UniProtKB/Swiss-Prot annotation, chain A:
GO terms for biological process: DNA replication initiation; pre-replicative complex assembly involved in nuclear cell cycle DNA replication; silent mating-type cassette heterochromatin formation. The lineage of its organism: Eukaryota, Fungi, Dikarya, Ascomycota, Saccharomycotina. Belongs to the ORC3 family. It comes from Saccharomyces cerevisiae (strain ATCC 204508 / S288c) (Baker's yeast). Keywords: Acetylation, DNA replication, DNA-binding, Nucleus. The gene is ORC3. Component of the origin recognition complex (ORC) that binds origins of replication. It has a role in both chromosomal replication and mating type transcriptional silencing. Binds to the ARS consensus sequence (ACS) of origins of replication. This is Origin recognition complex subunit 3. It is found in: Nucleus.
Swiss-Prot record, chain B:
The chain holds residues 97 to 478 of 479 of the full protein. It is found in: Nucleus. It comes from Saccharomyces cerevisiae (strain ATCC 204508 / S288c). Keywords: ATP-binding, DNA replication, Nucleotide-binding, Nucleus. GO terms for cellular component: Cul8-RING ubiquitin ligase complex; DNA replication preinitiation complex; nuclear origin of replication recognition complex; nuclear pre-replicative complex; nucleoplasm; nucleus. This is Origin recognition complex subunit 5.
UniProtKB/Swiss-Prot annotation, chain C:
This is Origin recognition complex subunit 2. The chain holds residues 238 to 620 of 620 of the full protein. It comes from Saccharomyces cerevisiae (strain ATCC 204508 / S288c). Component of the origin recognition complex (ORC) composed of at least ORC1, ORC2, ORC3, ORC4, ORC5 and ORC6. Interacts with MCM10 and TAH11. One of its GO terms (molecular function) is chromatin binding. The lineage of its organism: Eukaryota, Fungi, Dikarya, Ascomycota, Saccharomycotina. Present with 1700 molecules/cell in log phase SD medium.
From Swiss-Prot, chain D:
The chain holds residues 425 to 529 of 529 of the full protein. Component of the origin recognition complex (ORC) that binds origins of replication. It has a role in both chromosomal replication and mating type transcriptional silencing. Binds to the ARS consensus sequence (ACS) of origins of replication. Belongs to the ORC4 family. It comes from Saccharomyces cerevisiae (strain ATCC 204508 / S288c). The gene is ORC4. Present with 2170 molecules/cell in log phase SD medium. Component of the origin recognition complex (ORC) composed of at least ORC1, ORC2, ORC3, ORC4, ORC5 and ORC6. It is found in: Nucleus. This is Origin recognition complex subunit 4.
Amino acid sequence: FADAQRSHYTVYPSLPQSNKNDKHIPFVKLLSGKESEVNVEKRWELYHQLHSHFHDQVDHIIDNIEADLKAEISDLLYSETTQKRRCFNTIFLLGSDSTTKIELKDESSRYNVLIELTPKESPNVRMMLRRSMYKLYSAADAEEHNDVSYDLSLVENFKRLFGKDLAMVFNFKDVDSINFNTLDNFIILLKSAFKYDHVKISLIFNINTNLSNIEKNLRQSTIRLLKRNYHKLDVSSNKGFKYGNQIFQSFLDTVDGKLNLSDRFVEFILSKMANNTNHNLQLLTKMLDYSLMSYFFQNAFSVFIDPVNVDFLNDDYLKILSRCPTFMFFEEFFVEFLVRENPINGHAKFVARFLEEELNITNFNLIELYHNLLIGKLDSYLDRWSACKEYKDRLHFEPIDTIFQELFTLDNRSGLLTQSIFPSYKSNIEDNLLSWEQVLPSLDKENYDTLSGDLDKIMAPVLGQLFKLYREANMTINIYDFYIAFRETLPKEEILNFIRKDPSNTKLLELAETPDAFDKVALILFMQAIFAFENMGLIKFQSTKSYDLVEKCVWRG
Amino acid sequence: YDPLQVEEPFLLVKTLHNIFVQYESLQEKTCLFLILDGFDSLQDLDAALFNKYIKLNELLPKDSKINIKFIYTMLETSFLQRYSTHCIPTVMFPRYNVDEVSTILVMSRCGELMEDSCLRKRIIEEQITDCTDDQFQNVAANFIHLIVQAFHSYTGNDIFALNDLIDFKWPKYVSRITKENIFEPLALYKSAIKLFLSTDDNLSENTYDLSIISKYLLIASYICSYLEPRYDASIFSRKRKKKEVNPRYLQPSLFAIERLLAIFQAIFPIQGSLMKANIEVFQNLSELHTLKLIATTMNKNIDYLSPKVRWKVNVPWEIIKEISESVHFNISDYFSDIH
Amino acid sequence: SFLDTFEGYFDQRKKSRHTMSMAPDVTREEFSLVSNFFNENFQKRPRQKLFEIQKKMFPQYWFELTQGFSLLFYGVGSKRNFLEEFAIDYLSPKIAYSQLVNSIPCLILNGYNPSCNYRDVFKEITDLLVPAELTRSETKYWGNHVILQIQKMIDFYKNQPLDIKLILVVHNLDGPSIRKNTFQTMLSFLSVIRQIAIVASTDHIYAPLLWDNMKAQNYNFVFHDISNFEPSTVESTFQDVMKMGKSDTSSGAEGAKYVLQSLTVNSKKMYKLLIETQMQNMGNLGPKRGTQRTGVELKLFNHLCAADFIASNEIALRSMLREFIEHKMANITKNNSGMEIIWVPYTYAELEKLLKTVLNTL
Amino acid sequence: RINTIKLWLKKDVKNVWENLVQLDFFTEKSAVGLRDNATAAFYASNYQFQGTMIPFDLRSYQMQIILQELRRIIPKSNMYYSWTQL
DNA sequence: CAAGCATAAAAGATCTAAACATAAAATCTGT
DNA sequence: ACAGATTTTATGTTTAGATCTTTTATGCTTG
């Protein structure tokens, strides 16, 4: 068989028996493979220890967030409500990702059953009810250690069956995705469970957008019923700015003065953070980790972060660093300007703590503050609150005075950071396709050895050459005229000469003598290229019964 | 007999027969009424179910001591007419007049409103030690009459909604009661006039956390939906007349992804490039779709990549408008042609 | 005025009655011959030069993978050969050496095949990784077992040591049967597992439209640009080119024709018998799919094959039919009464075309 | 033309609209009320109707009672009888 | 331009095959 | 070798996916 024609077929490669002691490392010797292996190993171990140090604090912050939100929602769930048992209390979690384990407190006289429902697991009202009753029965029987049909009467008979009171808490995982007709019908159905005087219900709506859509979609009577007890709770990772600050401070401490943050890098962090709110902290952690690993990867001097290896400077290191612009503008010379820790991080931490303890200001972005301090306009960020006017005297910061920060910094000047996490996907495709010269390297050393040393240079790759005309084409394109133009742009005699260049095959030379051999090989190339465009989505075809016209989908830029 | 042993109507016939035969020692004929209260309110309803219960009584023994009589209860008067030829005796219940519903609310709520703990707390706090149960009944009846006369045109004759409004508005009304007010019926109306004009039955006590790029994508999607494509180039030349039928009242039209991206680039302000479509734009668009804001034109198992799927905005004019002022981008400017 | 801007698009947004019949006639055999000649003779040396230049980036890719970053390759040209070369020859032996013996298994998943099914992919993943079974309570009320098993796998693997035990190559992640939301959700939940590595490739321009915020987070992609203008011989195999692929693009019958063209004379004969029996059943019962109600019984098929000296007994027939089943040219299920049924999931028109174009020539 | 009539707001006419469509005065665009049997009802229950997902404002309805009959029923003394015909 | 005329695609009726599910009789396994 | 463990025949119950059919949102098209 042909394995390429298969699907999802496992392959067990035969690893060579040849092996070494410590050649197996992703890090490669920099400076044209001149650095020693000990430097690479030290870089690897320092990267691992620093990554562990950062991620431990990140995990602590994340766990703190989860614990705090769970405790707050559990406290709001009971809140010592004195309201009469004639309505069910509702909690709208504003903009909450459906990833939380709402814990229900154990009560001696009341079961507390968390029933979780999702849009995929709720096609209609009857299945909502059957799933809810099955979860209720299973949880109650597991807690308590014949059968009952799955309907609302299980709630009616609960006091008789298990000799205990009930408290069911409905957690709708994605309340925006469920079609609100069935959700409204299910709420109205649950309303019928208030004639028992031994069952209390609690609804939790994991809303993502706002309450405007809930008001618009739900029936007025249902909104009136919900309004008797509702609690708008705003739970989100992006609200209050009190959690991104902790992670950024953790990163700042895990780099300490050992590393420096470039102004453009923090500007990019802020820009990419401003464009996403539903999932913000994870994106920030990804960006920081990628920048850190890239900096330890493509920078050779990261082995010299700690002072102990400063003496390990060699002739190649000094020769390379001699071209540092800071050195031109300005062993023992380097260390006396390296061990000087940057006071910017300590000053920023002190300022943040000072404003967050007694100045009664909390809604601020530590990333924004750090970026502003890096620029140097800290007054322009501290004057917005209009409350630290008498405290600005002691909050002044001495301007940036540092040297040799190019070698120890986190920045994106080669564009890898932006093109590896948030690349301009379509724009990159069009940039690569329009200017194919910079994608395919041009070589002339071995053009004599190759069989096509005269045709490769003159012409262009078929797909990009077709894309040139396609961009220069009109909105609606006749296939015939497009092929005519493509063939006219195609050199005539050179194609025939290339065909004649192979004497091994016989069918090719047999077809070569045919007068329209060029006119049909060009057509074959055109069908191949148009198929590739259709697969890539550049072009589309209208009604296939006509198939004489095509429409351009994507435009360059 | 295990109640879970019945799975078809025939099994119910057999189980009822088996239960009724074992009660044959009854002295006198006994009828047992089974009130299916809310039969039309079934969520798995179909036309061919009620007549099963209609003809059920034929399949049961004639001479049994216990006879089961059905008393259904439906609420549609178009489900009933489907079986109008069965000639089963029925008692139609007409709706309630405004005076009737006011009297019913008075009768069913004056006791509860009088016995409110909030009113007792207000009275003991404000020190009015000269009152009778007649005075409390009169003030409760006056509140009921005021709320009915103020919101009957809005709520119709539904007792439930009027009860909800009364429960909603009573705390503030009793909070606005002082010494000389209670002994003057017009004083409360002239002092608590705020309650009785504008209804309050919405969760907002009396927008989107989306990004800027997502908000602009939503605005561009709405513009694409509610603008004619042949006018797009003329209107957006940023570098016989318009129709006055106000297409914002009709269903949104279907556009293509390329047009959406082009107009999104056109309307996005220059920062620092024209904000070339990147991973972030497409991710935001997909997140908007999974929020059911930009609905496609095909059923489930959706593939966003096929050149046969079209997008249409799924928000009304209010949400998109207040999003536009949320980002301070004009929306009644490109629609100034259609006012 | 302009051509590459939104203003240019608006400007561009506002006839020859010659079809391809008058165009030079094309035969499939000579089409394949000429296309193959052009593919490995046009820009061979520049392509190898570019491949060697970008091969040096492999340690960076491995370092990105070993830190919980699922990796994606996007760009023009076919990345199938390049990505397979990266994963099979470089990634697996190197990670096997670094973990310490045997190489790490490499589940490569052809996404350009419209016959790729998520049930079979998860069957392979659970046959190889062998995760623990889910308890009865964890099954939930009729919930999808694949997604629940994957979430249980995530819970179990959140505590295991962070060493890769599988690499799941995903060729053409934005293909016809691999772009649907179900399999994408499966891959999204599967990629969170640190112990497996998700290297994928995309071709469509609007491919990132497939991933929401949650799916993008779970993928945790690190996009990498690979563009080598390869002609994609393998990708075009599964779909027709004479009709430009505008019709029956996701049918998958062209791949079946290609694989059946030169497979075995006896296999072709029995496939012809099965196809003919299915057409007879369709006629006994408008173009419809070949569902189970119209398929052929296993006992009936064995009797028919024995009458034609194709397969003597059950054992040989089942052994030679497992090959067709694994390549999705046919399916075997059990009816409600328990009778085995074998059927071809291709459309009646597609079945007739397959019979009259390759089967009928013997 | 003018005592003064309070033009009710959108959010206060929404409840009247829901009550009016609940009393079966309006119907959906092309909606079948009750299915013939249990299988068809089950099939419909599993399906998700398009009109459900359309926002509340833009759901297209149809009328039980034509305007001429509405004129025929409403008494002449009523204050809306002038607008009961085009 | 609209009407006419045509094909096209949305909305849903109608249905099936598959995944998920339970259960009673007869078979296959160890002491 | 006798009771438990597994299998074989025989349904019921939801989810995912299919094609037919009807209606109506698109284009084609003169002034």
